[PDB]
Design a protein around this ligand. Structure first.
Ligand SMILES: [Zn+2]
Ligand SMILES: [Zn+2]
Lengths: 112, 50, 77, 91, 63, 252
RNA sequence: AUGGUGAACUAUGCCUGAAUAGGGUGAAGCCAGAGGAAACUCUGGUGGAGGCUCGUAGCGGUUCUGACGUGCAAAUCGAUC
RNA sequence: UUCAAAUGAGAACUUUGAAGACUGAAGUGGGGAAAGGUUCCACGUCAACAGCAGUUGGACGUGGGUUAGUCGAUCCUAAGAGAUGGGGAAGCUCCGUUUCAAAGGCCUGAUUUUAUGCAGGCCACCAUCGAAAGGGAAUCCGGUUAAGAUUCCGGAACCUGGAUAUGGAUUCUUCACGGUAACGUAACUGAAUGUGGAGACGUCGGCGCGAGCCCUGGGAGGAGUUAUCUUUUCUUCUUAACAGCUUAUCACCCCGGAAUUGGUUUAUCCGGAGAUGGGGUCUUAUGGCUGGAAGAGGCCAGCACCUUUGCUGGCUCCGGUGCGCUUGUGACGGCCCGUGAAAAUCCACAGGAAGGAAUAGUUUUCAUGCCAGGUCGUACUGAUAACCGCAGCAGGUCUCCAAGGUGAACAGCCUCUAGUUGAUAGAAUAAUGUAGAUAAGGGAAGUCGGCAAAAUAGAUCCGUAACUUCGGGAUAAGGAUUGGCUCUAAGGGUCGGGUACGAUCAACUUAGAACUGGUACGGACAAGGGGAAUCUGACUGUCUAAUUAAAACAUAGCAUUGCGAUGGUCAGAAAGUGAUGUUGACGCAAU
């Protein structure tokens, strides 16, 4: 049973010193250093992992093209579709009730 | 150590070049009293404190 | 590093003005149970990537080898 | 089956700390770990974190509350009192 | 050879037993096996139509 | 003799507060034109734990009147407030829980919290779990307002001093037996190094005035003057009475 | 007494990291069944709590008032804990 | 530890070979952090040193040796340190780090007088230091040296920064299309300003998936054993970073409409705020196929080579299994008066500034192509001889990997890989010792005292008192059983139903019966003595490092005291100074 070393100079089992044991074409086991796993991007409103978007570390989003980082709505890689729906509904309905408040106030104040 | 500063390494090199015995011809000179190198600095006996 | 499936694309890759070298690797494999056929791999070394084309048929292989450009330095194995 | 006669949740402390203390703790820890009804969604999904904070599993609403129960008697009195004062001003 | 004998049923008595029943095989493991079994049988029957969803529900909770 | 524990607390090297995980200072919004002529609306986004504080905090978000941005503020949560709730702050705001009004604008009997000693300090009184002040009268001349604090003291404050309506959440906290030294440890390792406490009677005379003896005793009256000086103040300081409290206190 | 040097040991706090076999007991919650006029109770399971427990690594350092006691050691060795 | 040989003047100790042994994957193995500093490697060599020896050496002497765009420092900020402005102080200097400061820059035009001013608009914060374990752009394989390697060679990739052109896409519906939708596509303008996310985070428990390891079958090879038996025992049969296609729970969409309530987890949560169901979308940890890449590496055969050192051929295949071990990961659950870092940095969105159509202009977030990637570190040990302990000291000193069997087990015992075989030796077996043991009969009479030692000991079954805070006591006490062999029974998966059951595959656990043995069987190892009672401290915990671990300290609980900020307690030589206080009576301080 082949045993394995850290291939780097840090000897401590830290979060950034993670080690996968991997067989090689020379037939030996070797440590392979693992980068930290990536978190999914989240909606500003609901906090859920929003879909369509890629899970990368931050400076890789610069390497990657834009179809990986956005979907084709307003508020694409920022907000969930149901959150967007809520705020559209809310906008339209409140902007209607604003008109209604205006005319109600007019019809009340112009009574005298 | 092994992940050093250059300052530490610079001093270690001077100590490597200082750790040699006398040239022989210096014993042959006129009005010579230097028989041996007193300031030897082996790594077991005496640490140089950087 | 990148596999290519289309011979048209492969021929442009050969005539891409930065491809100087190439190599032709012959292999020995078998067709799903029974008999050993003869596989061919045309590999062209661009600047960034090695493009390789897998051809399972020696006829297409023979036509393609003659269809290579003349200036390209070919290493047959 | 019923496993303890009277200690209930405070059997995790076993024989330690005294019966009166374990009893006070029992009374409060039940409320602490209970599920309550959401004023907003009408479901029974309100659990606490982090004393004074009561989250609904569904509906994601978070209410400021008591430490081991959602509403204290004082705050109940306060909302009723403030309602009465507001109505005393405008009604 | 000793493995083949233990397979046949040898060297498994009270004298060759130094750990507990739970240590050797936890009752939680045994439970999980049992209930996964019953659970997937019920599911396959409900899918095949050999049993309706109401009996499925009753038997799920009994299991 | 030697310098004692209570003395060197003031140097405060290892007696500083532990402030890493604190979300911030709980402060009311700066008293400005809107909040002293009308009202400004804000949204409660988060209700969040604050380490070393049994009371929860509310992250309220307001708009800046003068620049297009969102200015975020950290309130102490009144009991009953919730995420997605609108918080109205100012002179002409309605009497609802979570709203920030002046104590002149509120009526008598009103229950408030995080109430300014004087206008602009952004909250001083009734800030811990379960606490509130009561308003028990106005003096509209000279714009003052008389209030009961949670200690029982009556105070007189400016009517322009703001206070948030309702009681601060986290109440009932001190009803529960903490019940074990480890829980007291974890309490205080997020506040400061005030725990565990050794007794003067248990230590030597260099280390404390109560120290020494072939028995564990104090030897002198533990009641010690207000005019005592540092190193001599290690009992019941300026104690006007001592003993078990009997009968009606808060005599008036 | 004047002026200075030290927290590489140790004391305490903070910040940032790491380490911690296998077993026993078997708390809340949940399921079924039985009983009861009701209130509610019983039984069997599940579940896996605890500044719980046996016991490794480890951390300490009880007793032998053992070894040693011009030592391996200016505080160690061994067993027992 | 032994034998022989070689070396040499000389061999208990050097080298090689042959044996015998050990450490026994919480290692005498392989790596590293601190620290050391050349101890690394070679050659030569023994005066001293290695508490005997010495031909040997971490010694002596002479030399060689450390190669980086991708590893790290470098950068960020943490706790915190610390300038400036200002203020204190006779002063050395102190406070304080956003402040009672006129504390600057990003772009635009202007343009071919404009150098960089000027017509403008934008912003408000305001040093710097601080982590070879936290955050962080990017590399892998094979080979190579006496000694270096993720650094060299070969091959195959990626990031950043900058230059740039071609193709592609796009437009006269000038800044794209498809999909009901979730969303998709190789592209598919977009400043100031703003919003958001990632960075970015507890611990335990069990379940699931994956990787490697373990175990195992068939076959192609090699080795061993072969008086007899053994289709046998050991061994090789591997595949990187990266790229493309494809693949998952959770989550979401559409249809549809639920009570005879259903779905569903090991764990009971979910559904008219819209279930089950039918059909889809997504994340791509992970896995599969291809490329890389078999021309590599590995195992063999044949041919040769006074040499360089080779040449030529083959094989490198197909599976299975699981409460397995290690590790990662996902979804969940439990716990808290504890709810478990920040910043650099990157992206997205909102917004609609500005600019722009075809006789060619925009895109340098698509593809390809061009150039460059600095400085310092890099050998070795890492510990009973490379560090600290005056020393080659049984002491101390942070971490990674981690095989088979027994067995609950990372225990103990044995073994494979790997590494050691070092610790002054020989001869004898007096007393006294140190360490280990055994003892008739008695049995605590011993001693201050059962100190020491013995006895018990695992597991299964039975059985279990007083007292009790009802939780415990409790492994209470106290008893039985346990081997080997041959059998029996029970406990499952995947496929099939012309709209009651069959075929096929594979685990261990449990119970029982015969039989058998000089009545032995947790056969070594491992492994509680128990009971009745008192004093005392509630408990867990802590301390006199090197004579005192306790009844002392602490603790939860209880009580008192002061204080509403012109404040209480405390600090400071002073201060435009400070801790409590990122505080506010359910708080802080003092007992
Ligand atoms: Zn959302
Ligand atoms: Zn709700």
């Amino acid at each position: 049973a082949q045993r394995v070393t850290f291939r780097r100079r840090n000897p401590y089992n830290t979060r950034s010193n993670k080690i996968k044991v991997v067989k090689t074409p020379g037939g030996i086991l070797r440590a392979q250093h693992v980068k930290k796993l990536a978190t999914r991007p989240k909606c500003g409103d609901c906090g859920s992992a929003l879909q369509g978007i890629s899970t990368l570390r931050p400076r890789q989003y610069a390497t990657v093209s834009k179809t990986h980082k956005t979907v084709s709505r307003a508020y694409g890689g920022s907000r969930c579709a149901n959150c967007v729906k809520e705020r559209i509904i809310r906008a339209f309905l409140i902007e209607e009730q604003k008109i209604v408040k205006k005319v109600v106030k007019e019809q009340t104040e112009a009574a005298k | 150590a092994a992940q050093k500063s250059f300052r530490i390494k610079q001093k270690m090199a001077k100590a490597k070049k200082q750790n040699r015995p006398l040239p022989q011809w210096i014993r042959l000179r006129t009005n010579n009293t230097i028989r041996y190198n007193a300031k030897r600095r082996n790594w077991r006996r005496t640490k140089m404190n950087i | 590093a990148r596999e290519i499936t289309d011979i048209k694309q492969f021929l442009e890759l050969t005539r891409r003005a930065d491809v100087k070298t190439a190599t032709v690797k012959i292999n020995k494999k078998l067709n799903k149970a029974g008999k050993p056929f003869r596989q061919t791999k045309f590999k062209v070394r661009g600047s960034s990537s090695l493009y390789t084309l897998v051809i399972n048929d020696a006829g297409k292989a023979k036509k393609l080898i003659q269809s290579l450009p003349p200036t390209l330095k070919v290493n047959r194995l | 089956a019923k496993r303890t006669k009277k200690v209930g949740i405070t059997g995790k402390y076993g024989v330690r700390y005294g019966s009166s203390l374990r009893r006070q703790v029992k009374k409060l820890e039940i409320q602490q770990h209970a599920r309550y009804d959401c004023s907003f969604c009408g479901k029974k999904t309100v659990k606490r974190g982090a004393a004074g904070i009561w989250t609904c599993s569904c509906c994601k609403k978070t209410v400021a509350g008591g430490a081991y129960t959602v509403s204290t008697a004082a705050a109940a009195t306060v909302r009723s009192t403030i309602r009465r004062l507001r109505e005393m001003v405008e009604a | 050879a000793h493995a083949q004998s233990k397979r046949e049923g040898r060297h498994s008595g009270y004298g060759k037993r130094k750990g507990t029943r739970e240590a050797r095989l936890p009752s939680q493991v045994v439970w999980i096996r049992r209930l996964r079994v019953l659970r997937r049988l019920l599911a396959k029957y409900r899918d095949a139509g050999k049993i309706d969803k109401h009996l499925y529900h009753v038997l799920y909770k009994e299991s | 003799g030697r310098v004692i524990r209570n003395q060197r607390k003031g140097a405060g090297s290892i007696f500083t507060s532990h402030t890493r995980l604190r979300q911030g200072a709980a402060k009311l919004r700066t008293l400005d034109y809107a909040e002293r002529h009308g009202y400004i609306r804000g949204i409660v986004k988060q209700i969040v734990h604050d380490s070393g504080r049994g009371a929860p905090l509310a992250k309220v978000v307001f708009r800046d009147p003068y620049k297009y941005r969102l200015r975020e503020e950290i309130f102490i949560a009144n009991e009953g407030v919730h995420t997605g709730q609108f918080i109205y702050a100012g002179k002409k705001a309605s009497l609802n829980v979570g709203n920030v009004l002046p104590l002149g604008s509120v009526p008598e009997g009103t229950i408030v919290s995080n109430v300014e000693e004087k206008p602009g300090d952004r909250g001083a009184l009734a800030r811990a779990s379960g606490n509130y002040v009561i308003i028990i009268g106005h003096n509209p001349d000279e714009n003052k307002t008389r209030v009961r604090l949670p200690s029982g003291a009556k105070k007189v404050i400016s009517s322009d001093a703001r206070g948030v309506i309702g009681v601060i959440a986290g109440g009932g906290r001190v009803d529960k037996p903490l019940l074990k030294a480890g829980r007291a440890f974890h309490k205080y390792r997020l506040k400061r190094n005030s725990w565990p406490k050794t007794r003067g009677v248990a230590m030597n005379p260099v280390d404390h005035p109560h120290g020494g003896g072939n028995h564990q005793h104090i030897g002198k009256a533990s009641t010690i003057s207000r005019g005592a000086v540092s190193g001599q103040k290690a009992g019941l300081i300026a104690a006007r009475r001592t003993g078990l409290l009997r009968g009606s206190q808060k005599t008036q």
